[PDB]
Amino acid sequence: GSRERLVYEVRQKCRNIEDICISCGSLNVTLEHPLFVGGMCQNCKNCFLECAYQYDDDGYQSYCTICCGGRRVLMCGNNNCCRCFCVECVDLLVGPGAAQAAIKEDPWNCYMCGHKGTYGLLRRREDWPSRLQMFFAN
Protein backbone atom coordinates (compact mmCIF):
# COMPACT_ATOMS: atom_id res chain seq x y z
CA GLY A 1 0.00 0.00 0.00
CA SER A 2 3.01 2.29 0.28
CA ARG A 3 4.65 4.14 -2.58
CA GLU A 4 7.76 1.97 -2.23
CA ARG A 5 5.84 -1.30 -2.47
CA LEU A 6 3.89 -0.11 -5.47
CA VAL A 7 7.06 0.83 -7.31
CA TYR A 8 8.48 -2.58 -6.39
CA GLU A 9 5.49 -4.22 -8.07
CA VAL A 10 6.13 -2.10 -11.17
CA ARG A 11 9.72 -3.36 -11.45
CA GLN A 12 8.36 -6.93 -11.22
CA LYS A 13 5.93 -6.14 -14.05
CA CYS A 14 3.06 -6.93 -11.67
CA ARG A 15 1.76 -3.42 -12.42
CA ASN A 16 2.01 -0.76 -15.15
CA ILE A 17 3.69 2.48 -14.11
CA GLU A 18 0.98 4.45 -15.97
CA ASP A 19 -1.43 3.05 -13.36
CA ILE A 20 0.25 4.59 -10.33
CA CYS A 21 0.90 8.20 -9.37
CA ILE A 22 4.66 8.35 -9.66
CA SER A 23 4.88 11.33 -7.32
CA CYS A 24 2.95 9.89 -4.33
CA GLY A 25 1.97 6.29 -5.12
CA SER A 26 -1.81 6.91 -5.24
CA LEU A 27 -3.79 4.50 -7.40
CA ASN A 28 -6.26 7.27 -8.15
CA VAL A 29 -4.52 8.37 -11.36
CA THR A 30 -6.39 11.10 -13.23
CA LEU A 31 -3.87 12.08 -15.89
CA GLU A 32 -0.47 11.11 -17.28
CA HIS A 33 2.51 12.88 -15.64
CA PRO A 34 3.61 15.47 -18.19
CA LEU A 35 7.39 14.91 -17.91
CA PHE A 36 7.95 11.20 -17.20
CA VAL A 37 6.13 8.01 -18.06
CA GLY A 38 3.66 7.23 -15.24
CA GLY A 39 0.42 8.51 -13.71
CA MET A 40 -0.50 11.51 -11.66
CA CYS A 41 -3.26 11.84 -9.07
CA GLN A 42 -5.40 14.96 -8.40
CA ASN A 43 -3.42 15.90 -5.24
CA CYS A 44 -0.15 15.86 -7.13
CA LYS A 45 -1.64 17.67 -10.14
CA ASN A 46 -2.62 20.41 -7.72
CA CYS A 47 0.71 20.46 -5.98
CA PHE A 48 2.38 20.70 -9.44
CA LEU A 49 0.12 23.59 -10.45
CA GLU A 50 1.07 25.50 -7.30
CA CYS A 51 4.65 24.42 -6.79
CA ALA A 52 6.40 23.28 -9.98
CA TYR A 53 7.49 26.74 -11.09
CA GLN A 54 8.18 28.32 -7.73
CA TYR A 55 11.79 29.59 -7.66
CA ASP A 56 14.35 30.37 -4.94
CA ASP A 57 16.76 33.31 -5.05
CA ASP A 58 19.51 30.97 -6.23
CA GLY A 59 17.65 30.87 -9.53
CA TYR A 60 16.61 27.25 -9.05
CA GLN A 61 13.18 25.72 -8.66
CA SER A 62 12.18 25.42 -5.02
CA TYR A 63 11.21 21.75 -5.06
CA CYS A 64 11.67 18.35 -6.68
CA THR A 65 10.73 18.14 -10.36
CA ILE A 66 8.96 14.82 -9.78
CA CYS A 67 7.13 15.17 -6.44
CA CYS A 68 7.12 18.99 -5.97
CA GLY A 69 8.42 18.60 -2.43
CA GLY A 70 11.52 17.11 -0.80
CA ARG A 71 13.57 18.35 2.14
CA ARG A 72 16.95 17.97 0.48
CA VAL A 73 17.37 18.21 -3.27
CA LEU A 74 20.01 17.83 -6.00
CA MET A 75 20.35 20.73 -8.41
CA CYS A 76 20.93 20.39 -12.16
CA GLY A 77 24.41 21.46 -13.22
CA ASN A 78 23.25 22.42 -16.68
CA ASN A 79 23.88 26.13 -16.78
CA ASN A 80 20.65 26.35 -18.83
CA CYS A 81 18.44 24.27 -16.47
CA CYS A 82 17.00 25.28 -13.11
CA ARG A 83 15.58 21.91 -12.00
CA CYS A 84 15.95 19.97 -8.72
CA PHE A 85 15.32 16.32 -7.74
CA CYS A 86 14.91 14.90 -4.26
CA VAL A 87 16.87 11.90 -3.03
CA GLU A 88 13.72 9.93 -2.24
CA CYS A 89 12.29 10.13 -5.78
CA VAL A 90 15.66 9.43 -7.36
CA ASP A 91 16.49 6.36 -5.34
CA LEU A 92 12.97 5.05 -5.74
CA LEU A 93 12.34 5.60 -9.44
CA VAL A 94 15.90 5.30 -10.76
CA GLY A 95 17.30 2.85 -8.24
CA PRO A 96 18.99 2.71 -4.84
CA GLY A 97 22.31 4.56 -4.69
CA ALA A 98 21.51 6.57 -7.81
CA ALA A 99 21.17 9.82 -5.87
CA GLN A 100 24.63 9.56 -4.36
CA ALA A 101 26.17 8.88 -7.78
CA ALA A 102 24.45 11.97 -9.06
CA ILE A 103 25.61 14.08 -6.09
CA LYS A 104 29.18 12.96 -6.75
CA GLU A 105 28.95 13.66 -10.50
CA ASP A 106 30.38 17.06 -11.32
CA PRO A 107 28.88 18.59 -13.23
CA TRP A 108 25.60 16.70 -13.23
CA ASN A 109 22.98 16.95 -15.96
CA CYS A 110 19.60 16.19 -14.47
CA TYR A 111 17.13 13.57 -15.76
CA MET A 112 15.26 16.17 -17.78
CA CYS A 113 18.56 17.34 -19.40
CA GLY A 114 20.37 14.04 -19.83
CA HIS A 115 20.67 12.55 -23.30
CA LYS A 116 20.08 8.97 -22.15
CA GLY A 117 16.51 9.92 -21.24
CA THR A 118 15.72 6.70 -19.36
CA TYR A 119 17.00 5.99 -15.87
CA GLY A 120 15.70 2.88 -14.15
CA LEU A 121 11.92 3.34 -14.17
CA LEU A 122 12.28 7.06 -14.86
CA ARG A 123 11.62 7.66 -18.56
CA ARG A 124 11.41 11.21 -19.93
CA ARG A 125 8.54 11.67 -22.39
CA GLU A 126 9.64 12.51 -25.91
CA ASP A 127 6.89 15.02 -26.09
CA TRP A 128 7.21 16.72 -22.69
CA PRO A 129 7.00 20.24 -24.11
CA SER A 130 3.62 19.39 -25.70
CA ARG A 131 2.48 17.77 -22.48
CA LEU A 132 3.40 20.90 -20.50
CA GLN A 133 1.51 23.07 -23.02
CA MET A 134 -1.56 20.84 -22.48
CA PHE A 135 -1.13 20.78 -18.69
CA PHE A 136 -1.12 24.53 -18.37
CA ALA A 137 -3.82 25.00 -20.99
CA ASN A 138 -6.76 27.04 -20.18
Binding site: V73, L74, D106
Partner: peptide, 7 residues
Protein backbone atom coordinates in the same frame (compact mmCIF):
# COMPACT_ATOMS: atom_id res chain seq x y z
CA UNK B 1 25.38 17.84 -8.18
CA UNK B 2 25.08 20.73 -5.79
CA UNK B 3 22.55 20.08 -3.02
CA UNK B 4 20.28 22.36 -1.04
CA UNK B 5 17.71 22.28 1.71
CA UNK B 6 14.24 23.33 0.63
CA UNK B 7 13.27 24.54 4.11
Amino acid sequence: ARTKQTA
